A paper describes a structure:
BmCDA1 is composed of an N-terminal signal region (residues 1–23), a chitin-binding domain (residues 24–122), a low-density lipoprotein receptor domain (residues 123–161), and a catalytic domain (CAD, residues 162–539). Our experiments showed that full-length recombinant BmCDA1 was not stable and underwent autocleavage when incubated with the crystallization reagent. Thus, the truncated form of BmCDA1 (BmCDA1-CAD, residues 162–539) was cloned, expressed, and purified for crystallization. Diffraction data were collected to 1.98 and 2.4 Å on native and SeMet protein crystals, respectively, and the structure was solved using the SeMet single-wavelength anomalous diffraction technique. The overall structure of BmCDA1-CAD consists of two regions: a CE4-conserved NodB homology subdomain and C-terminal loops. The active site of BmCDA1-CAD is located at the top center of the (β/α)7 barrel and contains a metal-binding triad conserved across the CE4 family, namely, a zinc ion coordinated by Asp206, His261, and His265. Taken together, the differences in motif 4 and motif 5 confer BmCDA1 a more open and wider active pocket. The substrate-binding cleft is shallow and open when compared with the other microbial CDAs because of the lack of several loops that give microbial CDAs their characteristically deep and narrow substrate-binding cleft. Our study showed that the deacetylation activity of BmCDA1 was undetectable toward various chitinous substrates even with prolonged incubation time to 120 h or with higher enzyme concentrations at 200 μm. Taken together, these data indicated that BmCDA1 requires specific accessary proteins to achieve activity.
Carbohydrate esterase 4 family (CE4)2 chitin deacetylases (CDAs, EC 3.5.1.41) catalyze the removal of acetyl groups from chitin to form chitosan, a polymer of β-(1,4)-linked d-glucosamine residues. CDAs are widely distributed in protists, diatoms, bacteria, fungi, nematodes, and insects, playing vital roles in chitinous matrix formation and modification, as well as in biological attack of fungal pathogens. In this study, two CDAs from Bombyx mori, BmCDA1 and BmCDA8, were crystallized and resolved, providing the first insight into the structural characteristics, activity profiles, and deacetylation mode of insect CDAs. The structures revealed that insect CDAs possess several unique structural features that distinguish them from other known CE4 enzymes.
Author numbering: 162 to 542
Write the structure that this text describes.
C-alpha cells in the first residue's frame, strides 16, 4: 500500500532522519578513525533487590568514560516486582530508564499480533507508571523494547509515533560485517526482518530504531565457520566460562571497532551476571581493561547514541559534547531516605500481593494494564 520507500539520502537529513542504503554508513560521513566507539550496556526486565546491589558493583562511580563522566547504561524496565525508588535512584545517577511493558506477557503471539491500543496500554502505560512512582518529570523515558524482542509490525510503531516515544530497540539485525548503525523508520529497513515469525513494520514511522546487531558467538572466528548470532548476551548458549565470555567480548568489540564503529550493543538480563560470578568477573575485568586502554571508547545510554547521531562529534570533540556530560558524576542523596513499601493488590493480577516501593504515598491498588496510576478510578465511557 503505502510501503516506505528505500533510503533517499536527499530527503533524509540530520538531525530528524538518518539512513543509508544498507545501514552501515557512518552518520555525517565522519571517517571511522575519528568516531568514538559507543557501547550501550542494557538491562532488561524488572529492577529490584535481585539486582540493585549488582548494579552498584558495576556502576560504582569510579568507572569513567574518557570525558571523566561515569559510564552509563540503559534499563528497559518491566513493571511487575519493580522497585520504583531504585528506578528513581538509577535515573538520578544518570542512567537511562526505558519501557519494557507492564505485563511482560508470556505469549509471543500476543505481541506479534497486538493492536495499536494493546501496544499503548503496555508501553505508554509503563511510561505512566515510571513517571509517577519514580517521580520523573523531564520527559526522558523515551525508549521501548518489547518482551522476547517480539516486533509488532506497523502497530507497534504507529503507537510509538502517536505516543511520542523517541526510539525502539526491538528489531534484530542478523550477524553482519560490518554491523549496522541505528536508523529512523521513515524509510524501508536496511535489512531483513529477522527471527521466528517476526512481524516487522513496512510503512513510514517517525521513530528511531536502535537496531540490535547479533553478536558473533564463535569461539575461534577463523576456523569455526557457521553459527547463528545472538542478540542477548545470555542467549549465546555456548558461552560457559569466564574465559569464553572474555574472548567473546574482545572479538565482537573488534568487529565494531575495526570496521564502521557502529554502536556495540551488550544486552543483558540482570540474573545471568549475578547467578554466574565467573561471568560478572570477566565482564568487569573486560570493562576495566577497555576503559584503561582506550581514550576513544564511550559507555553511553541509548538516548545518548541518538544525540550523537543527530550531531556527530569526533573523538576529540566528544570530551566536551554536552549531552554526554549530563549528570556527569552525580553524588548527592536519594530523593527519600526510607521509601514506602506498599503491599498492593489488584483484580487484574488475581490472587497475588505485590510489594511496590516508592517515595510517593502508596496508591490505592496495584498498577496494571487498565489502571497504570493505581488510583482505582472509574474510567469514562
Ligand atoms: C528499594 O529501593 C530503594 C532504593 O535503592 C532501597 O532503599 C534503601 O533502603 C535503605 C533501608 O531502607 C535505606 O537506608 C537507603 O537509604 C535506601 N537507599 C536509597 C538509594 O534510597 C530499598 O531498600 C529497596 N527495597 C526493596 C524491598 O527492594
Ligand atoms: C518530585 O520531585 C520534586 C523535586 O525533588 C519534588 O519537589 C516533588 O515533591 C516530587 N513529587 C512528588 C509527587 O513527590
Ligand atoms: Zn524481558
Amino acid at each position: 500500500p503505502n510501503r516506505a520507500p528505500p533510503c533517499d539520502s536527499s530527503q533524509c537529513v540530520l538531525p530528524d532522519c538518518f539512513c543509508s542504503e544498507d545501514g552501515t554508513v557512518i552518520p555525517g560521513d565522519l571517517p571511522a578513525r575519528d568516531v568514538p566507539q559507543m557501547i550501550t550496556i542494557t538491562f532488561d526486565d524488572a529492577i529490584n533487590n535481585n539486582n540493585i546491589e549488582l548494579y552498584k558493583e558495576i556502576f560504582n562511580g569510579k568507572r569513567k568514560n574518557p570525558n571523566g563522566c561515569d559510564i552509563k547504561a540503559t534499563y528497559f524496565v518491566s513493571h511487575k516486582y519493580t522497585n520504583y525508588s531504585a528506578v528513581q535512584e538509577t535515573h538520578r545517577k544518570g542512567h537511562e530508564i526505558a519501557v519494557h511493558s507492564i505485563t511482560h506477557n508470556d505469549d509471543e503471539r500476543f505481541w506479534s499480533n497486538a493492536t495499536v491500543d494493546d501496544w499503548g496500554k503496555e508501553m505508554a502505560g509503563m511510561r505512566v507508571i515510571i513517571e509517577k512512582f519514580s517521580n520523573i518529570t523531564d520527559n526522558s523515558v523515551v525508549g521501548v523494547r518489547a518482551p522476547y524482542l517480539r516486533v509488532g509490525g506497523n502497530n507497534q510503531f504507529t503507537m510509538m509515533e502517536e505516543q511520542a516515544f523517541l526510539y525502539d530497540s526491538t528489531i534484530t539485525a542478523p550477524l553482519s560485517n560490518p554491523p549496522l548503525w541505528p536508523y529512523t523508520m521513515y524509510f524501508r529497513m536496511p535489512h531483513r526482518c529477522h527471527g521466528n515469525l517476526q512481524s516487522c513494520p513496512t510503512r513510514s514511522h517517525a521513530v528511531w530504531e536502535m537496531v540490535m546487531n547479533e553478536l558473533d558467538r564463535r569461539e575461534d572466528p577463523s576456523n569455526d565457520e557457521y553459527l547463528p548470532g545472538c542478540a542477548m548476551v545470555d542467549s549465546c548458549s555456548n558461552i560457559l566460562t569466564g574465559d569464553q565470555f572474555y574472548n567473546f567480548l574482545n572479538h565482537n568489540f573488534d568487529r565494531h571497532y575495526e570496521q564502521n564503529r557502529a554502536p556495540l550493543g551488550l544486552y543483558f538480563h540482570a540474573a545471568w551476571l549475578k547467578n554466574n560470578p565467573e561471568f560478572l568477573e570477566a565482564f568487569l575485568y573486560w570493562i576495566d581493561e577497555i576503559l584503561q586502554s582506550h581514550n576513544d571508547v564511550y559507555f553511553v545510554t541509548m538516548t545518548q547514541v541518538i544525540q550523537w547521531v543527530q550531531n556527530p562529534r569526533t573523538v576529540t570533540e566528544a570530551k566536551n559534547f554536552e549531552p554526554w556530560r549530563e549528570k556527569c558524576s552525580v553524588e548527592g542523596n536519594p530523593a527519600c531516605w526510607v521509601p514506602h513499601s506498599c503491599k498492593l493488590t489488584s483484580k487484574e493480577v488475581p490472587g497475588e500481593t505485590i510489594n511496590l516501593q516508592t517515595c510517593l504515598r502508596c496508591p490505592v491498588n496495584y498498577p496494571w494494564l487498565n489502571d497504570p496510576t493505581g488510583d482505582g478510578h472509574y474510567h469514562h465511557h
